[PDB]
């Protein structure tokens, strides 16, 4: 069901051509929301890593047994295993690394587990296979394009004294949605003496509850969808989440909120459908007001996050932004007035926001970062 | 107006007779709320460190004219000067570790600030002078206390499977409040190989946004109380911080809130008497209710960062905390209700919970350890 593309053997046939006995190599997994991906990489920067699988996957399951068949494909070709391997992944990580719970998949706690007790020992050697998570592996990635001096290839500024990006041993927020709110924390930690290069800390605060806001134009919609979205979600016991708004669902939720009352509303299924919906030439109001909720609850947490972490800048990744950015920089006047909406503004007005400009999987490429350097 | 402690004369004399020329020492230095302490540290645990000083101090002008004379009377003593300084107060730390700016002081940011170079040479050397934040020194008077065996000496266990107080290798949040709302993390970043001890990461979340609660039996005095607060601190601009309740200050202005329309309610002038009034309840237990509310929001914002944080344990510490142990002691149940009344209970219900037990400078003790291992 799954096959190594025969765009990829060459590369691979190369490999063994060039490294012979000493041949070595590096195995990085990007489970995404749809697809997951397998990429090897030799760990020579003259010799680019080469992608080898790209499949359907939303089960462990599924994940683990096409894991299986491109291990067995690798093996007909490379005939060696490999000698690291690094997973990414939407969820928390286990202590050790052994273990990835997929915080949006459906079922048992155990069902959303992905261990490596199924893993084809092939592809992820017993003593050098880590899970992580998939915005820390967007950390991983942005440190491996700032190392190869790449990073303005893939990053501009929105807001920056700068007109290119450039990494400093400086706090940074990085933020992607999808199936979920990511977020992680690129930390510069010790002053002076004690300065250590940035380490990376994931973070699960897409999950933390909302803040409101008071400012009388917007206090009243908001009141009523947290309100309404608590008792579609919780009947009424707690409080949204920021990934209740801020994710896939949570954009078609507002969506089907603000056309609660309209039948005649174009009704749509997707975010992907009510962006599309949004980036139209005249785009109808309904789509275009779900989107800016969507957009003014990602920077309230920013906001806050930026404030509580003292960040100096915050990364806006992931694929789906860089189609999004002629409608966030359409509107970018409404993002940075409620990111500044804070009784400290001038903690935060000059907080850099980077934004992702060209498409680009830096999750794969944080996750094979992370296993040749391990 | 500023003298070195009679009892400590003695002591200082016997390191110079002890060390004579070689004398090496470090100077710690504590800004608290109402006095400001200093201490000196040889280094080695075989000299027991002196506090050498205490004195009011609510000004940048009153620590440096303070810490002047304190620097001349050491002087006259030792006849050495210091290798080296930590100074521990309640704001943000410039990139350098050159200044500290006190976030609730009056006036200009100028006049928040301390830098170093308004410090007297004899005891805050050139080169080896840093400001650091005031839950930052906690953090390494915990890692002090820690390695010194004495962590449990200082801390009980109020939520745990255990009977005594350890640190793992685990994110920790700590915890404290006065003028402020006081939260760093002690985090251990890497899995695997990867693994660091336990670094310190100050932050500034008492000065996020708060979030409500949908409990609908508190739901309503909550939101009378966030409007009441954010027209009086902000016109009603923006939404209140966690600090405008949980503080001090905050403690009085709940107070004041639930008891408007009481004329006979006792009219207390400081949290310290309301804390009092709130565990030898009086027969209207007003105090009761306010101070309820205080610890109802830092349980609000521990449970956000415990699950943002991924921390596995919270400490809180400091004098206060001491005091009001009999009260959040005897109200746990209500303080574990809010804690867990998340979408996502599981994720948090595990997380471990120790209090000081008795006073103790560790905000002094961490700033002596971040001078000697710097
Ligand atoms: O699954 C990861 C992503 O891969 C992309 O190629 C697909 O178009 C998306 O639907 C998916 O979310
Ligand atoms: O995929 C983005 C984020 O989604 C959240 O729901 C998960 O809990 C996170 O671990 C993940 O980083
Ligand atoms: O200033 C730090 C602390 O010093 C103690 O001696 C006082 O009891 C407190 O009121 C004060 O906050
Ligand atoms: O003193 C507790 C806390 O008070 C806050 O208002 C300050 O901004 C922090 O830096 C400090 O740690």
């Given at each position: 069901?799954?096959?190594?593309?025969?765009?990829?053997?060459?590369?691979?046939?190369?490999?063994?051509?060039?490294?012979?006995?000493?041949?070595?190599?590096?195995?990085?997994?990007?489970?995404?929301?749809?697809?997951?991906?397998?990429?090897?990489?030799?760990?020579?920067?003259?010799?680019?890593?080469?992608?080898?699988?790209?499949?359907?996957?939303?089960?462990?399951?599924?994940?683990?047994?096409?894991?299986?068949?491109?291990?067995?494909?690798?093996?007909?070709?490379?005939?060696?295993?490999?000698?690291?391997?690094?997973?990414?992944?939407?969820?928390?990580?286990?202590?050790?690394?052994?273990?990835?719970?997929?915080?949006?998949?459906?079922?048992?706690?155990?069902?959303?587990?992905?261990?490596?007790?199924?893993?084809?020992?092939?592809?992820?050697?017993?003593?050098?296979?880590?899970?992580?998570?998939?915005?820390?592996?967007?950390?991983?990635?942005?440190?491996?394009?700032?190392?190869?001096?790449?990073?303005?290839?893939?990053?501009?500024?929105?807001?920056?004294?700068?007109?290119?990006?450039?990494?400093?041993?400086?706090?940074?927020?990085?933020?992607?949605?999808?199936?979920?709110?990511?977020?992680?924390?690129?930390?510069?930690?010790?002053?002076?003496?004690?300065?250590?290069?940035?380490?990376?800390?994931?973070?699960?605060?897409?999950?933390?509850?909302?803040?409101?806001?008071?400012?009388?134009?917007?206090?009243?919609?908001?009141?009523?969808?947290?309100?309404?979205?608590?008792?579609?979600?919780?009947?009424?016991?707690?409080?949204?989440?920021?990934?209740?708004?801020?994710?896939?669902?949570?954009?078609?939720?507002?969506?089907?909120?603000?056309?609660?009352?309209?039948?005649?509303?174009?009704?749509?299924?997707?975010?992907?459908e009510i962006s599309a919906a949004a980036f139209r030439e005249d785009?109808?109001?309904?789509?275009?007001?779900?989107?800016?909720?969507?957009?003014?609850?990602?920077m309230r947490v920013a906001k806050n996050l930026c404030v509580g972490?003292?960040?100096?800048?915050?990364?806006?990744?992931?694929?789906?932004?860089?189609?999004?950015?002629?409608?966030?920089?359409?509107?970018?006047?409404?993002?940075?007035?409620?990111?500044?909406?804070?009784?400290?503004?001038?903690?935060?007005?000059?907080?850099?926001?980077?934004?992702?400009?060209?498409?680009?999987?830096?999750?794969?490429?944080?996750?094979?970062?992370?296993?040749?350097?391990?």
């Open positions: 069901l799954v096959d190594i593309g025969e765009e990829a053997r060459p590369a691979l046939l190369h490999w063994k051509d060039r490294f012979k006995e000493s041949l070595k190599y590096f195995v990085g997994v990007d489970i995404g929301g749809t697809n997951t991906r397998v990429a090897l990489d030799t760990g020579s920067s003259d010799e680019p890593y080469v992608q080898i699988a790209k499949f359907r996957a939303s089960s462990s399951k599924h994940i683990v047994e096409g894991l299986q068949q491109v291990a067995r494909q690798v093996a007909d070709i490379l005939g060696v295993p490999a000698s690291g391997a690094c997973l990414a992944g939407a969820g928390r990580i286990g202590d050790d690394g052994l273990s990835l719970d997929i915080t949006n998949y459906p079922g048992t706690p155990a069902d959303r587990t992905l261990t490596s007790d199924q893993l084809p020992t092939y592809l992820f050697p017993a003593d050098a296979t880590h899970y992580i998570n998939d915005l820390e592996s967007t950390c991983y990635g942005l440190k491996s394009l700032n190392e190869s001096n790449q990073l303005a290839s893939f990053f501009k500024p929105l807001w920056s004294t700068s007109d290119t990006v450039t990494m400093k041993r400086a706090n940074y927020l990085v933020l992607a949605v999808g199936t979920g709110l990511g977020i992680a924390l690129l930390t510069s930690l010790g002053r002076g003496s004690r300065n250590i290069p940035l380490q990376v800390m994931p973070m699960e605060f897409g999950h933390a509850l909302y803040s409101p806001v008071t400012d009388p134009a917007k206090k009243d919609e908001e009141d009523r969808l947290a309100a309404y979205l608590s008792k579609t979600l919780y009947s009424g016991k707690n409080a949204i989440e920021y990934e209740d708004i801020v994710s896939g669902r949570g954009v078609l939720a507002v969506y089907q909120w603000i056309t609660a009352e309209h039948k005649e509303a174009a009704k749509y299924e997707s975010a992907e785009p109808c109001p309904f789509a275009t007001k779900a989107l800016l909720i969507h957009y003014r609850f990602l972490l003292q960040a100096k800048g915050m990364f806006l990744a992931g694929d789906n932004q860089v189609v999004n950015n002629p409608f966030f920089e359409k509107y970018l006047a409404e993002m940075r007035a409620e990111f500044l909406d804070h009784p400290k503004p001038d903690w935060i007005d000059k907080v850099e926001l980077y934004t992702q400009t060209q498409s680009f999987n830096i999750n794969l490429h944080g996750a094979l970062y992370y296993a040749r350097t391990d």
